[PDB]
Coordinates of C-alpha atoms in Angstrom, one line a residue:
Chain E
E1 CA 59.2 -39.4 -56.4
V2 CA 58.6 -36.2 -58.4
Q3 CA 60.9 -34.6 -60.9
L4 CA 60.0 -31.6 -63.1
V5 CA 62.3 -31.0 -66.1
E6 CA 62.6 -27.5 -67.5
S7 CA 63.4 -26.7 -71.2
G8 CA 62.6 -24.4 -74.1
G9 CA 64.7 -21.3 -73.3
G10 CA 67.0 -19.3 -75.5
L11 CA 67.8 -15.9 -77.0
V12 CA 65.1 -14.0 -78.9
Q13 CA 64.7 -10.5 -80.2
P14 CA 61.9 -8.3 -78.6
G15 CA 58.5 -9.0 -80.2
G16 CA 59.4 -12.7 -80.8
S17 CA 57.7 -15.8 -79.7
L18 CA 58.7 -18.9 -77.9
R19 CA 57.2 -21.9 -76.1
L20 CA 58.4 -23.6 -72.9
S21 CA 57.8 -27.1 -71.6
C22 CA 57.7 -28.8 -68.2
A23 CA 57.4 -32.5 -67.9
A24 CA 55.9 -34.0 -64.8
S25 CA 57.0 -37.4 -63.5
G26 CA 55.4 -39.3 -60.6
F27 CA 52.1 -37.4 -60.7
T28 CA 49.5 -36.1 -63.2
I29 CA 48.9 -32.5 -64.0
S30 CA 45.2 -33.3 -64.6
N31 CA 44.5 -33.1 -60.9
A32 CA 47.4 -30.8 -59.6
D33 CA 47.4 -27.0 -59.7
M34 CA 50.6 -25.7 -61.4
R35 CA 52.4 -22.3 -61.3
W36 CA 55.0 -20.7 -63.5
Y37 CA 57.7 -18.6 -61.8
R38 CA 60.4 -16.2 -63.0
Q39 CA 63.3 -14.6 -61.2
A40 CA 64.9 -11.7 -63.0
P41 CA 68.6 -11.1 -62.1
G42 CA 69.1 -9.1 -58.9
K43 CA 65.5 -9.4 -57.6
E44 CA 63.1 -11.9 -56.1
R45 CA 60.5 -14.1 -57.6
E46 CA 56.8 -13.7 -58.4
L47 CA 53.9 -15.5 -60.0
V48 CA 53.5 -15.7 -63.8
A49 CA 50.7 -18.1 -64.8
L50 CA 48.6 -20.6 -62.9
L51 CA 46.5 -23.5 -64.3
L52 CA 44.1 -24.2 -61.4
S53 CA 42.9 -27.7 -62.0
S54 CA 41.0 -27.4 -58.7
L55 CA 39.0 -24.4 -60.1
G56 CA 37.7 -26.2 -63.2
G57 CA 41.0 -25.9 -65.1
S58 CA 40.9 -22.1 -65.6
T59 CA 44.1 -20.4 -66.6
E60 CA 45.2 -17.1 -64.9
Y61 CA 48.0 -14.6 -65.5
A62 CA 49.6 -11.7 -63.7
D63 CA 48.8 -8.2 -64.7
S64 CA 52.3 -7.6 -66.0
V65 CA 52.2 -10.5 -68.4
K66 CA 48.4 -10.5 -69.2
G67 CA 47.6 -10.2 -72.8
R68 CA 51.0 -11.6 -73.8
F69 CA 51.4 -14.9 -72.0
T70 CA 49.3 -18.0 -72.7
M71 CA 49.4 -21.1 -70.5
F72 CA 47.8 -24.5 -71.3
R73 CA 48.2 -28.2 -70.6
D74 CA 47.6 -31.5 -72.4
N75 CA 47.5 -34.7 -70.4
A76 CA 48.7 -37.0 -73.2
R77 CA 52.4 -36.1 -73.0
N78 CA 52.2 -35.1 -69.3
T79 CA 53.8 -31.7 -70.1
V80 CA 52.8 -28.1 -69.4
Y81 CA 53.6 -25.2 -71.8
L82 CA 53.8 -21.4 -71.5
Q83 CA 53.5 -19.7 -74.9
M84 CA 55.1 -16.2 -74.8
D85 CA 54.3 -13.5 -77.3
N86 CA 55.4 -9.8 -77.7
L87 CA 58.3 -10.3 -75.3
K88 CA 59.9 -7.1 -74.1
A89 CA 63.4 -6.7 -72.7
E90 CA 61.9 -6.6 -69.2
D91 CA 61.1 -10.3 -69.4
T92 CA 64.7 -11.5 -69.3
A93 CA 64.7 -14.0 -66.4
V94 CA 64.9 -17.6 -65.4
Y95 CA 61.6 -19.4 -65.4
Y96 CA 60.6 -22.1 -62.9
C97 CA 57.9 -24.9 -62.9
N98 CA 56.3 -25.2 -59.5
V99 CA 53.5 -27.4 -58.2
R100 CA 51.0 -25.6 -56.0
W101 CA 51.1 -26.0 -52.2
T102 CA 54.4 -28.0 -52.4
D103 CA 58.1 -27.5 -52.8
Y104 CA 58.6 -29.5 -56.0
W105 CA 60.4 -27.0 -58.3
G106 CA 62.1 -27.0 -61.7
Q107 CA 65.7 -26.5 -62.5
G108 CA 64.9 -23.3 -64.5
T109 CA 65.6 -22.0 -68.0
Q110 CA 66.9 -18.7 -69.2
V111 CA 64.8 -16.6 -71.6
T112 CA 66.7 -13.6 -72.8
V113 CA 65.0 -10.8 -74.7
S114 CA 67.3 -8.2 -76.3
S115 CA 68.5 -6.8 -79.6
Chain J
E1 CA 17.6 -6.0 -46.2
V2 CA 17.1 -4.9 -42.6
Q3 CA 13.4 -4.1 -42.2
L4 CA 12.5 -2.6 -38.8
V5 CA 8.9 -1.3 -38.9
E6 CA 7.7 0.3 -35.7
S7 CA 4.3 1.3 -34.3
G8 CA 2.8 2.9 -31.2
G9 CA 1.9 6.4 -32.2
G10 CA -1.3 8.4 -31.6
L11 CA -2.5 11.7 -30.2
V12 CA -2.1 11.1 -26.5
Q13 CA -2.9 14.1 -24.2
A14 CA -0.6 16.0 -21.9
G15 CA 0.8 13.8 -19.2
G16 CA -0.3 10.6 -20.9
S17 CA 1.5 7.4 -21.4
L18 CA 2.2 5.4 -24.6
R19 CA 4.3 2.4 -25.4
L20 CA 6.1 2.1 -28.7
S21 CA 7.4 -1.1 -30.4
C22 CA 9.9 -1.8 -33.1
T23 CA 10.2 -5.3 -34.7
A24 CA 13.6 -6.0 -36.2
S25 CA 14.0 -8.6 -38.9
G26 CA 16.7 -9.8 -41.2
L27 CA 19.4 -8.9 -38.6
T28 CA 20.6 -10.5 -35.4
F29 CA 18.6 -8.7 -32.7
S30 CA 20.4 -10.2 -29.7
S31 CA 23.8 -8.8 -30.8
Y32 CA 22.8 -5.3 -31.9
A33 CA 22.3 -2.4 -29.5
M34 CA 19.1 -0.5 -30.4
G35 CA 18.3 3.1 -29.9
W36 CA 15.3 5.4 -30.4
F37 CA 15.6 8.8 -32.1
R38 CA 13.2 11.7 -32.5
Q39 CA 12.5 14.4 -35.1
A40 CA 10.8 17.6 -34.1
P41 CA 8.8 19.3 -36.8
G42 CA 11.0 21.2 -39.2
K43 CA 14.2 20.0 -37.6
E44 CA 16.8 17.2 -37.8
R45 CA 17.1 14.0 -35.8
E46 CA 18.1 13.8 -32.1
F47 CA 19.2 10.9 -30.0
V48 CA 16.7 9.9 -27.3
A49 CA 17.5 6.5 -25.8
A50 CA 19.6 3.4 -26.2
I51 CA 19.9 -0.1 -24.8
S52 CA 22.6 -2.7 -24.8
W53 CA 22.2 -6.3 -26.0
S54 CA 21.5 -7.6 -22.5
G55 CA 19.0 -4.8 -21.7
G56 CA 20.9 -3.8 -18.6
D57 CA 22.6 -0.6 -19.8
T58 CA 20.5 2.4 -21.0
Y59 CA 21.1 6.1 -21.5
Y60 CA 18.7 8.9 -22.3
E61 CA 18.9 12.5 -23.4
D62 CA 19.2 14.7 -20.2
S63 CA 15.8 16.4 -20.9
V64 CA 14.0 13.0 -21.2
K65 CA 15.9 11.0 -18.6
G66 CA 13.2 11.6 -16.0
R67 CA 10.5 9.6 -17.6
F68 CA 11.5 7.3 -20.5
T69 CA 12.3 3.6 -20.0
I70 CA 13.6 1.6 -22.9
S71 CA 13.6 -2.2 -22.6
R72 CA 14.0 -5.0 -25.1
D73 CA 12.4 -8.4 -25.7
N74 CA 14.7 -10.9 -27.6
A75 CA 12.0 -13.5 -27.8
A76 CA 9.9 -11.8 -30.5
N77 CA 12.6 -9.4 -31.7
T78 CA 11.1 -6.2 -30.4
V79 CA 12.6 -3.1 -28.8
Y80 CA 10.3 -1.0 -26.6
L81 CA 10.2 2.5 -25.3
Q82 CA 7.9 3.6 -22.4
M83 CA 6.7 7.2 -22.6
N84 CA 5.8 8.5 -19.2
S85 CA 4.5 12.0 -18.2
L86 CA 4.4 13.3 -21.8
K87 CA 4.8 17.0 -22.6
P88 CA 3.6 19.1 -25.5
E89 CA 7.3 19.5 -26.6
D90 CA 7.5 15.7 -27.3
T91 CA 5.7 15.9 -30.6
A92 CA 8.0 14.2 -33.0
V93 CA 8.3 11.2 -35.3
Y94 CA 10.2 8.4 -33.4
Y95 CA 12.5 6.3 -35.5
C96 CA 13.9 3.0 -34.3
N97 CA 17.4 2.1 -35.4
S98 CA 20.4 0.0 -34.4
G99 CA 24.2 -0.2 -34.4
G100 CA 26.9 0.2 -31.8
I101 CA 26.5 0.7 -28.1
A102 CA 28.9 3.6 -27.6
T103 CA 28.9 5.3 -31.0
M104 CA 25.1 6.2 -30.9
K105 CA 24.7 9.9 -30.4
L106 CA 26.4 10.9 -33.6
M107 CA 23.8 10.6 -36.4
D108 CA 26.2 10.2 -39.3
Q109 CA 26.7 6.5 -39.8
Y110 CA 22.9 5.8 -40.0
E111 CA 22.0 4.6 -43.5
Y112 CA 18.3 4.2 -44.0
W113 CA 15.5 4.8 -41.5
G114 CA 12.2 3.1 -40.5
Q115 CA 8.9 4.4 -41.7
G116 CA 8.6 6.0 -38.2
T117 CA 5.7 6.6 -35.9
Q118 CA 4.2 10.1 -35.5
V119 CA 3.6 10.9 -31.8
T120 CA 1.9 14.2 -31.1
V121 CA 0.9 15.5 -27.7
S122 CA -1.8 18.2 -27.3
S123 CA -1.8 20.6 -24.4
Chain L
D1 CA 25.8 -11.1 -38.7
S2 CA 26.8 -10.1 -35.2
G3 CA 26.7 -6.6 -33.9
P4 CA 29.5 -4.1 -33.3
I5 CA 30.9 -4.6 -29.8
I6 CA 31.3 -0.8 -29.1
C7 CA 31.5 1.5 -32.1
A8 CA 29.6 1.5 -35.3
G9 CA 31.1 1.4 -38.8
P10 CA 33.6 4.1 -39.6
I11 CA 33.1 7.0 -42.0
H12 CA 36.5 7.7 -43.4
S13 CA 37.5 10.9 -45.2
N14 CA 41.3 11.3 -45.6
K15 CA 42.9 8.1 -46.8
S16 CA 46.3 9.1 -45.4
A17 CA 45.1 9.8 -41.9
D18 CA 47.5 8.4 -39.4
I19 CA 46.3 5.5 -37.2
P20 CA 47.3 6.1 -33.5
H21 CA 48.0 3.5 -30.9
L22 CA 45.6 4.2 -28.1
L23 CA 46.3 2.4 -24.8
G24 CA 42.8 1.9 -23.6
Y25 CA 41.3 -1.6 -23.8
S26 CA 37.9 -0.2 -24.8
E27 CA 39.6 2.0 -27.3
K28 CA 41.4 -1.0 -28.8
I29 CA 38.0 -2.8 -29.0
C30 CA 36.5 0.2 -30.8
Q31 CA 39.5 0.1 -33.2
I32 CA 38.8 -3.6 -33.7
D33 CA 35.2 -2.8 -34.5
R34 CA 36.0 -0.3 -37.2
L35 CA 38.5 -2.7 -38.9
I36 CA 41.3 -0.3 -38.0
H37 CA 43.5 -3.3 -37.2
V38 CA 43.2 -4.7 -40.7
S39 CA 43.8 -1.3 -42.3
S40 CA 46.9 -0.8 -40.1
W41 CA 48.1 -4.4 -41.0
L42 CA 47.7 -3.7 -44.7
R43 CA 49.6 -0.3 -44.3
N44 CA 52.4 -1.9 -42.4
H45 CA 52.9 -5.0 -44.6
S46 CA 51.3 -4.8 -48.1
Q47 CA 52.1 -1.1 -49.0
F48 CA 48.4 -0.3 -48.8
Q49 CA 47.0 3.2 -48.2
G50 CA 43.5 4.0 -47.0
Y51 CA 41.1 2.0 -44.9
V52 CA 39.1 -1.2 -45.2
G53 CA 35.7 -1.8 -43.5
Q54 CA 34.4 1.6 -44.7
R55 CA 30.8 2.2 -43.7
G56 CA 30.4 -1.5 -42.9
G57 CA 32.6 -2.2 -39.9
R58 CA 33.5 -5.6 -38.6
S59 CA 29.9 -6.9 -38.7
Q60 CA 29.9 -7.7 -42.4
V61 CA 33.4 -9.2 -42.8
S62 CA 33.3 -12.2 -45.2
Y63 CA 33.8 -15.7 -43.7
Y64 CA 34.5 -19.1 -45.1
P65 CA 32.0 -20.8 -44.8
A66 CA 29.4 -18.1 -44.6
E67 CA 27.6 -19.8 -41.8
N68 CA 30.0 -19.4 -38.8
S69 CA 29.0 -20.4 -35.3
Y70 CA 31.4 -18.0 -33.6
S71 CA 30.7 -15.1 -36.0
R72 CA 27.2 -14.5 -34.6
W73 CA 28.8 -14.0 -31.2
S74 CA 30.3 -10.5 -31.5
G75 CA 32.5 -10.8 -28.4
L76 CA 34.5 -13.7 -29.8
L77 CA 37.8 -12.5 -31.2
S78 CA 39.2 -13.6 -34.5
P79 CA 43.0 -14.0 -35.1
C80 CA 43.2 -10.5 -36.4
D81 CA 41.4 -9.1 -33.4
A82 CA 43.7 -11.1 -31.1
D83 CA 46.6 -9.6 -33.1
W84 CA 45.5 -6.1 -32.4
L85 CA 45.3 -6.9 -28.7
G86 CA 48.8 -8.3 -28.5
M87 CA 47.8 -11.9 -28.0
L88 CA 49.3 -13.3 -31.2
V89 CA 51.0 -12.0 -34.4
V90 CA 49.7 -12.4 -37.9
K91 CA 52.7 -12.8 -40.2
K92 CA 53.1 -11.7 -43.8
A93 CA 52.7 -14.6 -46.2
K94 CA 55.8 -16.1 -47.8
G95 CA 56.3 -18.2 -50.9
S96 CA 56.0 -21.5 -49.0
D97 CA 52.7 -20.6 -47.4
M98 CA 49.7 -22.4 -48.8
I99 CA 46.5 -20.7 -50.0
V100 CA 43.5 -22.9 -49.4
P101 CA 41.1 -23.4 -52.3
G102 CA 37.3 -23.0 -52.1
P103 CA 36.7 -19.5 -50.8
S104 CA 35.6 -16.8 -53.3
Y105 CA 38.9 -14.8 -53.6
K106 CA 37.8 -12.4 -56.3
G107 CA 38.0 -8.8 -55.1
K108 CA 39.4 -9.5 -51.7
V109 CA 42.2 -7.3 -50.4
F110 CA 43.0 -9.3 -47.1
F111 CA 42.4 -12.8 -46.0
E112 CA 43.9 -14.8 -43.2
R113 CA 43.8 -18.5 -42.2
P114 CA 45.2 -20.3 -39.2
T115 CA 48.1 -22.5 -40.3
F116 CA 49.5 -25.4 -38.4
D117 CA 52.4 -23.3 -37.2
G118 CA 50.9 -19.8 -36.6
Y119 CA 48.7 -17.4 -38.4
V120 CA 49.3 -16.1 -42.0
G121 CA 47.6 -13.2 -43.6
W122 CA 47.7 -12.3 -47.3
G123 CA 47.3 -8.7 -48.5
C124 CA 47.2 -6.9 -51.8
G125 CA 48.8 -3.6 -52.6
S126 CA 47.2 -0.2 -53.1
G127 CA 44.9 0.0 -56.1
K128 CA 45.0 -3.8 -56.4
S129 CA 42.7 -6.7 -55.6
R130 CA 43.2 -10.4 -55.3
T131 CA 42.1 -12.5 -58.2
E132 CA 39.8 -15.6 -58.1
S133 CA 42.7 -18.0 -57.2
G134 CA 43.8 -15.8 -54.3
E135 CA 47.4 -16.0 -55.4
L136 CA 47.6 -12.8 -57.5
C137 CA 47.0 -9.1 -57.2
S138 CA 45.5 -7.4 -60.2
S139 CA 44.5 -3.8 -61.0
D140 CA 41.0 -2.8 -60.1
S141 CA 39.1 0.5 -60.4
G142 CA 36.9 -0.5 -57.5
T143 CA 39.7 -0.5 -54.9
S144 CA 41.0 2.9 -56.2
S145 CA 39.2 5.5 -54.1
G146 CA 41.3 4.5 -51.1
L147 CA 38.2 3.5 -49.0
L148 CA 37.0 0.0 -49.3
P149 CA 33.9 -1.7 -47.8
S150 CA 34.0 -4.7 -45.5
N151 CA 33.2 -7.2 -48.2
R152 CA 36.8 -7.0 -49.3
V153 CA 38.0 -8.7 -46.1
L154 CA 37.9 -12.5 -45.8
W155 CA 38.5 -14.5 -42.6
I156 CA 38.9 -18.2 -42.9
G157 CA 37.7 -20.7 -40.3
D158 CA 35.5 -20.8 -37.2
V159 CA 38.2 -19.3 -34.9
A160 CA 37.9 -18.0 -31.4
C161 CA 40.9 -16.6 -29.5
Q162 CA 41.0 -15.9 -25.8
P163 CA 43.3 -15.5 -22.8
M164 CA 45.3 -18.6 -22.2
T165 CA 46.4 -20.3 -19.0
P166 CA 49.9 -21.7 -19.5
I167 CA 50.4 -25.5 -19.5
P168 CA 53.7 -27.4 -19.1
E169 CA 55.6 -29.4 -21.6
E170 CA 54.5 -32.9 -20.3
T171 CA 50.9 -32.1 -21.0
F172 CA 51.7 -30.9 -24.5
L173 CA 53.7 -34.0 -25.3
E174 CA 50.9 -36.2 -24.1
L175 CA 48.4 -34.3 -26.2
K176 CA 50.7 -34.6 -29.2
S177 CA 50.9 -38.3 -28.6
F178 CA 47.2 -38.5 -28.5
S179 CA 46.9 -36.5 -31.7
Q180 CA 49.4 -38.7 -33.6
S181 CA 47.6 -41.8 -32.4
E182 CA 44.3 -40.3 -33.6
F183 CA 45.6 -39.1 -37.0
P184 CA 47.9 -42.0 -38.2
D185 CA 47.2 -41.2 -41.9
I186 CA 48.5 -37.6 -42.0
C187 CA 52.2 -37.0 -42.9
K188 CA 52.4 -33.2 -43.4
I189 CA 50.2 -30.3 -42.4
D190 CA 51.1 -27.0 -44.1
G191 CA 54.5 -28.4 -44.8
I192 CA 55.3 -29.0 -41.1
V193 CA 56.7 -32.5 -40.5
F194 CA 54.0 -34.7 -38.9
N195 CA 54.6 -38.4 -38.2
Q196 CA 57.3 -40.0 -40.4
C197 CA 56.1 -41.0 -43.9
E198 CA 58.0 -42.6 -46.8
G199 CA 55.2 -41.8 -49.3
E200 CA 53.7 -38.3 -49.8
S201 CA 50.5 -37.6 -51.7
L202 CA 49.4 -34.3 -53.2
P203 CA 48.2 -31.8 -50.6
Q204 CA 44.5 -31.8 -50.0
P205 CA 42.1 -29.5 -48.2
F206 CA 41.4 -30.6 -44.6
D207 CA 38.7 -29.3 -42.2
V208 CA 39.5 -30.2 -38.6
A209 CA 39.2 -28.8 -35.1
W210 CA 42.3 -27.5 -33.6
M211 CA 43.6 -25.7 -30.5
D212 CA 46.5 -23.3 -29.9
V213 CA 47.7 -24.3 -26.4
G214 CA 50.9 -22.6 -27.5
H215 CA 54.1 -24.3 -28.6
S216 CA 55.9 -25.4 -31.7
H217 CA 52.7 -26.5 -33.4
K218 CA 48.9 -26.7 -33.0
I219 CA 47.0 -29.8 -31.8
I220 CA 44.2 -31.2 -34.0
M221 CA 41.5 -33.4 -32.6
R222 CA 38.6 -35.5 -34.0
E223 CA 36.7 -36.2 -30.8
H224 CA 36.3 -33.6 -28.0
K225 CA 33.7 -32.0 -25.8
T226 CA 34.0 -28.3 -25.5
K227 CA 32.4 -26.5 -22.5
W228 CA 32.0 -22.8 -22.1
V229 CA 32.4 -21.0 -18.8
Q230 CA 31.9 -17.4 -17.8
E231 CA 34.3 -15.9 -15.3
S232 CA 33.4 -12.2 -15.6
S233 CA 37.0 -11.0 -15.3
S234 CA 38.2 -7.6 -16.3
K235 CA 38.7 -8.7 -19.9
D236 CA 35.0 -9.4 -20.3
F237 CA 33.9 -5.8 -19.6
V238 CA 34.2 -2.9 -22.0
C239 CA 33.6 0.6 -20.7
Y240 CA 32.3 3.4 -22.9
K241 CA 31.0 7.0 -22.7
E242 CA 27.4 8.1 -23.2
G243 CA 27.3 8.3 -27.0
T244 CA 30.6 9.8 -28.2
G245 CA 33.0 6.8 -28.0
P246 CA 35.2 4.5 -25.9
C247 CA 36.8 5.9 -22.7
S248 CA 40.4 6.6 -22.3
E249 CA 43.1 4.8 -20.2
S250 CA 42.4 6.9 -17.1
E251 CA 38.6 6.7 -17.1
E252 CA 38.7 3.0 -17.8
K253 CA 41.2 2.3 -15.0
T254 CA 39.2 4.5 -12.6
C255 CA 35.9 2.7 -13.3
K256 CA 37.4 -0.8 -13.4
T257 CA 39.4 -0.5 -10.2
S258 CA 37.9 2.2 -7.9
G259 CA 34.4 0.8 -8.5
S260 CA 32.6 4.2 -8.7
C261 CA 31.2 4.0 -12.3
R262 CA 27.6 3.0 -13.0
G263 CA 26.6 0.3 -15.5
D264 CA 24.8 -3.0 -15.5
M265 CA 24.2 -5.4 -12.7
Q266 CA 26.9 -7.9 -13.7
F267 CA 29.5 -5.2 -13.5
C268 CA 27.9 -4.1 -10.2
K269 CA 28.6 -7.4 -8.5
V270 CA 31.9 -8.0 -10.3
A271 CA 33.5 -4.6 -9.6
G272 CA 31.0 -2.1 -8.0
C273 CA 28.9 0.7 -9.5
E274 CA 28.0 4.2 -8.6
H275 CA 24.5 4.8 -7.2
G276 CA 22.4 7.6 -5.9
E277 CA 22.5 10.5 -8.4
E278 CA 22.0 9.8 -12.1
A279 CA 23.6 12.8 -13.9
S280 CA 26.9 11.0 -14.8
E281 CA 27.2 11.7 -18.5
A282 CA 30.9 12.4 -18.3
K283 CA 31.5 9.3 -16.2
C284 CA 32.2 6.1 -18.1
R285 CA 29.9 3.1 -18.0
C286 CA 30.8 -0.6 -18.4
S287 CA 29.0 -3.6 -19.8
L288 CA 29.9 -7.2 -20.7
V289 CA 30.9 -8.3 -24.2
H290 CA 28.5 -10.5 -26.0
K291 CA 30.5 -13.7 -25.8
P292 CA 29.6 -17.1 -24.4
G293 CA 32.7 -17.0 -22.2
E294 CA 36.0 -18.9 -22.7
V295 CA 36.3 -22.4 -24.1
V296 CA 37.5 -25.2 -21.9
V297 CA 38.4 -28.3 -24.0
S298 CA 38.2 -31.8 -22.6
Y299 CA 40.5 -33.7 -25.1
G300 CA 42.9 -36.5 -24.6
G301 CA 41.9 -37.3 -21.1
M302 CA 43.0 -34.3 -19.0
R303 CA 41.3 -31.1 -19.9
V304 CA 43.0 -27.9 -21.0
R305 CA 42.0 -24.3 -21.8
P306 CA 43.4 -23.3 -25.2
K307 CA 44.5 -20.0 -26.5
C308 CA 42.4 -20.3 -29.7
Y309 CA 39.8 -23.0 -30.5
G310 CA 38.7 -23.2 -34.1
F311 CA 37.4 -25.2 -37.1
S312 CA 39.4 -24.0 -40.1
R313 CA 40.8 -25.3 -43.4
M314 CA 44.4 -26.5 -43.6
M315 CA 46.5 -28.6 -46.0
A316 CA 47.4 -32.2 -45.4
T317 CA 49.6 -34.7 -47.2
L318 CA 48.1 -38.2 -46.8
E319 CA 50.1 -41.4 -46.6
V320 CA 50.5 -43.6 -49.7
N321 CA 51.9 -47.1 -50.0

C-alpha cells in the first residue's frame, strides 16, 4: 500500500512565504524520485520541482518557479517539503505530490496568492 | 578527429600512370562513401570521383571518366584512385574526403580537408 | 559512427522553410539522413521552429549506450526512421509515460525510447532544452539560433526496424505464454499489466531484448538466437543521381521496374542494369543500403520475423511478498 497525504496550503498575500508537506507511507523517499505538481484552474498540469534520488539527490525546478521555489527532503519524518518564496498571483493553484514513474498521487492542497 | 592523410603525388610525365592512396582513421571506413577532389592552380575545388561503401558504384567527372578508376580496400582503411593516361591539364592538388554517396558534387558541406597531394604533369 | 545512407549533413539557412512530403523512397531516405524527420516531428508536436541535425546529419545522433551494435550499420532504421517511412508512429509523450534514468539528458531537444506498448518521443519547445533529469524544458541561449546540431538528439536502445511478415494470433499467444513463463518475477512494464501481482515494488530500469511482432504489446525474451538474412528486395536498394541528390518518384520507378538503369552488380542481378554506353549522368543509379539484412528471431520454439528487434531500457515493477 502507498498513501501520500497533502497539507500546508492556505491564503497568503503576494510576496509571502509558505511551506508544504507530503508524508509518504509504505515506501521511503530516500530511494524514490519525487515530483511536485500544480494545476491552476482552467488549465492542465505541469512539473514544479523534482528531487531525483536516482541522480545523487539533486533538486531541480522549472524555469517559471526557479529562483523562488526550494525543495528538500529529510528521511527522519518521511516527509517532503516545498518552500515557496516571493509568490505571485500567477501561482494560485492546487499542488500535488507524485512519485516518479508511478501513478501514486496526492489529494492536493490549494495555495491562493492574492491581495 | 577524422584524420585522412593521403599520398601518391609526384611529377609524372605526359601519359604516365600514378596511384594515389588515402588512409582514413578515427571514422568508420566501411560505411562512408569516399570521393576524390581536385584543385587547379588559382581555382576552387572540383569533384573528380566517388565510390560507394561496397566499391561497386563509382562516378567520375565527364572529362576524366575515360581513364580514372577509384577502388577501395576496407582491410587497411585506404581509398585508391588510379590515374591512367595523364594530361598536362591534370596538374592539381588531390584531396581525399568522405560523406554521402549522392550528395557529393556540391562542395559546401565539406568541413576540413586533408593535407593533399600535389600532382603535376609536364608536357 | 556509421555513414550517411544517401545524402550528407544539411546546411540550413531559413529556419521557417517548409518541409515538403516527397513521395520517392530514396527521397525519404535522404530526408531521414538529414534528420528532416525529427525536425518535422518537433514542428508538428512540440511547437518547435527550425531544424535539428544541422551540419552533422544522422551520423552523429547520440545513443544510449554510446556503443551501439546497430548504429554502426547505417542501413538499419531507428524507430524515428521507421516513423518517417510509415511503418510505425512515434506518439507525443503524456504524463503517465516514464522517462528512463541514466542517459545524459542535459541539452537534448528530442529523445525517444521504445515502450512496452509503442514508441514515445519527448520534445522541447522552441528556444528551450531538456534539463539533466529529462523531465523539464528550460531556457537556453544555445538552442536559440533556430538551427541545432545533431548532438541535441538522443535515441535510446539498440533498435532495428524492418518490414514485417504478419503472424496470426495463435503464434502471438504462444509467444506471450513463453514470455510469461520466462519472466515470472515481473508484474508491470511501463504501466502495462503483466502477470497478476498482489505486491508491487518501485519501478526499476530494465535492459532486455524485445520484438515488435505487432499486437497489443511487445514480447521480451531472455534466450534467443537471431539470424540475419539478405533478400535483396526492392526495399534494400536506394537509387540516386550522379552528385546532386536522390531521384524522384518517376526515375526511381523507371529504374527499379523497367531495369534500364546502371548501378552495381547486386542490383544488376536483382533487377537489371543498363550497359553499353556510359554517358548516363541524367539517369539514376541504384545501390544496396549498408545493412546486414533483416533479422529472423528463433524464440519460443517456432521462429518469427519481427517488425523491430531491439535491446533498450524499459521500466519494470518487480514482485514482492
